Every structure is written in C-alpha cells, then in structure tokens.
Amino acid sequence: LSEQLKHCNGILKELLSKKHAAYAWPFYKPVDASALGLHDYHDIIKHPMDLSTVKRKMENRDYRDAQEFAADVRLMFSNCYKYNPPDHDVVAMARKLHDVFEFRYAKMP
Numbered sequence: 250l251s252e253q254l255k256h257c258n259g260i261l262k263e264l265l266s267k268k269h270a271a272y273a274w275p276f277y278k279p280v281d282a283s284a285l286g287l288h289d290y291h292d293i294i295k296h297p298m299d300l301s302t303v304k305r306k307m308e309n310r311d312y313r314d315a316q317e318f319a320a321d322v323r324l325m326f327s328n329c330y331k332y333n334p335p336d337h338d339v340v341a342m343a344r345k346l347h348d349v350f351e352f353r354y355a356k357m358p
Contacts, residue, residue: 252358253315258307260276260353264322265300269349272342276300276325282332315357322350 264273279299282290291297303321305311312318329343 250314254307256357257312257315257318257354259330260322260350261300261303261307261318264346264350265304265351266277270333272345273300275339275342276330276346280328287332290332294328296324298322298328300325315354316341319354323347326350 263269265277276299279297279302280287280290280294282288303318303325306321307318313319318347324345326343329340333340
C-alpha cells in the first residue's frame, strides 16, 4: 500500500531519469496541441495525461494505490497509440518506455 506507492514512485523516477530520456521526452509534459498544430487532438483524446501530471498527482497523494497510478501511466500510452499512426516515430518511443514501465511494474511488492 504505502510500500506499493513507494515502488510506483521509484518507477516514476526511473521513467523521468537520464537512462530513458532519449525516448521518454515526448511524455514529459502535457501535449501542447495548439503549439504543435494538432487542432484535432482534444477532439480525439478525452483524457490527456503525461509524466509531469503523474508526478504532481503522486506528490499530492492523489493515488491511493498502485492500480490507480498504473491506470494513468497506461492512459498516457493509450492516448499516443490512439492519436498517432502505429508506424509513427513517437509511437516507437512510446512502445519502449511502455516496456520499461510494464516490466518494473510487474515487480511490485
């Protein structure tokens, strides 16, 4: 519970760390749809999510358990898979960071 949330915080720190920065960077901050010219993004994605939002939520004790934390991290990846064609560069980066996430999440106490 507290212990599972510590494991989740460890995962989050790893996802934001230099080790994974070459492919994690698209997930660091909310998608700025206007700035990127993605004028359909918010018609297609109902629930935006990104790692800075997950971090704020963890810091504020929003997540009561691991499952709630994981749902947001997975939501972030699902948004990427929903919006972008499956052969897009950002999707290749998502698959790698998602693999990092799932393998360490599976080691939950």
